[PDB]
C-alpha cells in the first residue's frame, strides 16, 4: 500500500520543509477537515551498471494524518525524515476514511500544490 | 501488438515493430537468484508494453522455471504457491517502473 | 549513420533510432523558463553518452541566448562565462544517465 500521491524529489542538500498552512497536496474528495498529514522521506538504494550500490535522490511521500507507514505518530512529532503540513482549518483526527492508495485499483494522483507555495531550494518541477 | 504501417509514395508500405532487449537481475532470494539470472533473465519486449504486464510475464517465467525443482526449494523455505501469489516489482537502475535494457526483479518496491 | 535496409524491387529504407529527451533547466531561476520553452526538446541517437549530450545541450543554451546577450548582462549574466562552464545533465534520480526527462545545472546533483 502506497501514498495517494506521487513524490517530491530532493535534489539539493536541504530537507523538505513547508511554511505553516502550506504543503498539503491538492485533492478533491477532501473537506478542509482533512488537510493535514506528513511527508516521509523514502530511501532508494539500487545497484548501478558498475555493480556498486547507489543512493538515489530521496523521494518524499505525503500521507494523511493517521495513515500509512507512520500512522502512529501524532501531528508535530519530531522525527528524522518526517515533516508535518496542515492547511488552516484541518482537524487533528486520523483520516481513516481517506486511508492509503492500493496500486492495483488506483493510479497515484500527481502532487500539485496551490500556486504560491514555497518549496526549498533543490526541489524542482 | 500490430506492426506500425508507415507508407511512402504511391503504394509502398513499411511495417515497423519496436523492441527492447531486457535483461533482468533477479533479487528474490539470494540462495536461488543466480539460477534465475541464468535460466529466465533474457526477454525481448515490445516497446509499448506496460511494465506491470511485463512483470506478469516475468512472474510466470520464474514459477515455470521453479516448478520442476519445487521440492529442493521447500527445505530452503521457498514455497512456490506463495511465490506465485506475490507481487513482482520490475524497475530500472534508477528505480523507475520503466522498460530498460537492464532491470531488477524484486518482491519489495524500490522506494522504502 | 542511418541504417540502409534493402528490400525486393530495389526499395531501400534508411532507419535511425532516437530517444526523446526533455530538459528542465536549473541554471538561473530568472531565465530558466525561456530555456525551457526554446531549447529543452532534443532527439538523441540511441546509445549516446550523457557527456556528449551535455556538450550538445550546453551549445544550444549559448546559441539560444547570444541574440539576447545585451539583455542578460544587466541581469548579471555574462554569456562568455556561461560559454565556458561545465553543464551537468542528470535524471530524476540524480544519475548522470541519459533519460526521457533530465535536469541541467551548473552544480552536480543530489
Residue numbers in the entry:
A (entry chain A): 49 to 173
B (entry chain B): 0 to 111
C (entry chain C): 1 to 110
Paper text:
CoV-N protein is a multifunctional protein that plays a crucial role in the viral life cycle. The N protein comprises the N-terminal domain (N-NTD) and the C-terminal domain (N-CTD), sandwiched by three intrinsically disordered regions (IDRs), namely the N-terminal arm (N-arm), the central linker region (LKR) containing the Ser/Arg (SR)-rich motif, and the C-terminal tail (C-tail). In particular, the N protein interacts with Nsp3 to facilitate viral replication and infectivity. The coronavirus nucleocapsid (N) protein interacts with non-structural protein 3 (Nsp3) to facilitate viral RNA synthesis and stabilization.
